[PDB]
């Protein structure tokens, strides 16, 4: 029962929760227990593509991330080819060593990799770079299957990236996008308050077709999460 | 100040040092203070300040002594009347972290007897006086001398076993502290010390104690309607 909830359609597995979102897409949820404060949920994705599994974001810790891999073994039983992690904070990159130990190739924005050690994180093995329009440079993201990686500009952090899943209704905003009933934008300590609104809108325009918006700290929402996030961010300028 | 958890600043609000103050009624203000958690950001906590004639009454400290001293400095600047007493609403840091600042200022402090018994087990300082309660939750009046408009009610165990609540007589405001979450809340906050069996009934008991309060003030979000009480209770129904 995190401080920052479980419903029908959720599967507990060890200390994590999994929810199927589409025939080949699942949301993973893990929890950080903070002394005196309680547990904080964070969400990522698991995608089955062409006999392999692709992961978006680690859990908060190496042990929780190893639990993700065990769930994948039990439920899907296909090799995990790669992971994409969406910025250099613990909720997204806390489990990199578990991925590396398992032989999984890891990818992050070059800037995330540069920030990683300064943020307490292990860097990904490979760096993604981006065009001026935000789209990933194709040669840096080989064999990504249906994953469409987009850098929307600075927002929650300067390095935040986002991921659409081609052939589905799903796009993943990570910690950039907050839900349509949110009171705030979460932790703004590392945020770019000038550019945030434009970055939220750029995410929406990059994935114009996605009706299910997945994000780190709330359940999947409509495109109203994008609109609402942008309007909250307009107030920061 | 843009806390990670808690309401944001809006029109009305006064920034004073590290805190924010919002007038809720001619004689009632909300104080807000912030705890920075490394890697997570700031967490807001709210209490109340009430003017009762020629004296001021406080509900809850800030997270720290220094923040609580700042509350007292705001009261001196904006109201310029003495603080007669403070009521603190359970033995967690957000509500009792600043007891030493109140004691240094010479302010009489009151808490549930249970909160005073628990405070030292959390490394905190007990209030100097103990409130006790009837079987229906109303404070025993002899334990709450000269409380003016503060009507203290123990609704039963919920967020904690000791949590108390305060209606402000002569207004349409009631304070639920950390028992009550806002009408759009996704969770009941920290349940580490909570009574999941009794929470829903306790939330409803608070609503029934102050049935004509239309403005519900709470620790970690902006003042809300009575939908905060009903939503809290509905979330708590799921815990049993
Ligand atoms: C380096 O990252 N360390 C983190 C961490 O991952 N914090 C993130 C952050 O602050 O952005 C989490 N993300 C958040 C967000 O708005 O995306 C909020 C929730 C706070 S917790 C941390 C340390 C302690 C608790 O969380
Ligand atoms: C002794 O209390 N120590 C606290 C503390 O006051 N925590 C409180 C609590 O957890 O109940 C706050 N209150 C909360 C609540 O649901 O009322 C949530 C917000 C977590 S922060 C603490 C340590 C670090 C952050 O909060
Ligand atoms: Zn982050
Ligand atoms: Zn986050
Ligand atoms: Zn508490
Ligand atoms: Zn609290």
Curated annotation (Swiss-Prot), chain A:
Its cofactor is Zn(2+). GO terms for biological process: antibiotic catabolic process; response to antibiotic. Substrate binds at residues 178, 187. Inhibits by captopril, thiorphan, dimercaprol and tiopronin. This enzyme is not susceptible to inactivation by the beta-lactamase-blocking agents clavulanic acid. The keyword Cell membrane does not apply. Its main location: periplasm. Zn(2+) 2 binds at residues 91, 175, 217. Its EC number is 3.5.2.6. SMART domains: Lactamase_B (SM00849). It catalyses: a beta-lactam + H2O = a substituted beta-amino acid. It is found in: Periplasm. Confers resistance to the different beta-lactams antibiotics (penicillin, cephalosporin and carbapenem) via the hydrolysis of the beta-lactam ring. Does not confer resistance to the polymixin colistin or the fluoroquinolone ciprofloxacin. Monomer. Enterobacteriaceae carrying this gene (identified by PCR) have been isolated in Sweden, India, Pakistan, Bangladesh, England, Scotland, Northern Ireland, Australia and the USA. The organisms they were identified in were K.pneumoniae, Enterobacter cloacae, E.coli, Proteus spp, Citrobacter freundii, Morganella morganii, Providencia spp and Klebsille oxytoca. In India most isolates were from community-acquired infections rather than hospital-acquired infections, indicating the gene is widespread in the environment. This is Metallo-beta-lactamase type 2. The lineage of its organism: Bacteria, Pseudomonadati, Pseudomonadota, Gammaproteobacteria, Enterobacterales.
């Amino acid at each position: 029962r995190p401080t920052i909830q479980m419903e029908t359609g959720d599967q507990r597995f060890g200390d994590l929760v999994f929810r199927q979102l589409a025939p080949n897409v699942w949301q993973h949820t893990s929890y950080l227990d903070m002394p005196g404060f309680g547990a904080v949920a964070s969400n990522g994705l698991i995608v089955r593509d062409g006999g392999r599994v692709l992961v978006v974001d680690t859990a908060w810790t190496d042990d929780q991330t190893a639990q993700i891999l065990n769930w994948i073994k039990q439920e899907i039983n296909l090799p995990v080819a790669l992971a994409v992690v969406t910025h250099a904070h613990q909720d997204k990159m806390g489990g990199m060593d578990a991925l590396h130990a398992a032989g999984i190739a890891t990818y992050a924005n070059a800037l995330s990799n540069q920030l990683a050690p300064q943020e307490g994180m292990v860097a990904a093995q490979h760096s993604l770079t981006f065009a001026a329009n935000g789209w990933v440079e194709p040669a840096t993201a080989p064999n990504f299957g249906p994953l469409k990686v987009f850098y929307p500009g600075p927002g929650h952090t300067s390095d935040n990236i986002t991921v659409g899943i081609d052939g589905t209704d799903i796009a993943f905003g990570g910690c950039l996008i907050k839900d349509s009933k949110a009171k705030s934008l979460g932790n703004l300590g590392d945020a770019d308050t000038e550019h945030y609104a434009a970055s939220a809108r750029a995410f929406g325009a990059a994935f114009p077709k996605a009706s299910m918006i997945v994000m780190s700290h709330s359940a999947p929402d409509s495109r109203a999460a994008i609109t609402h996030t942008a309007r909250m961010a307009d107030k920061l300028r």
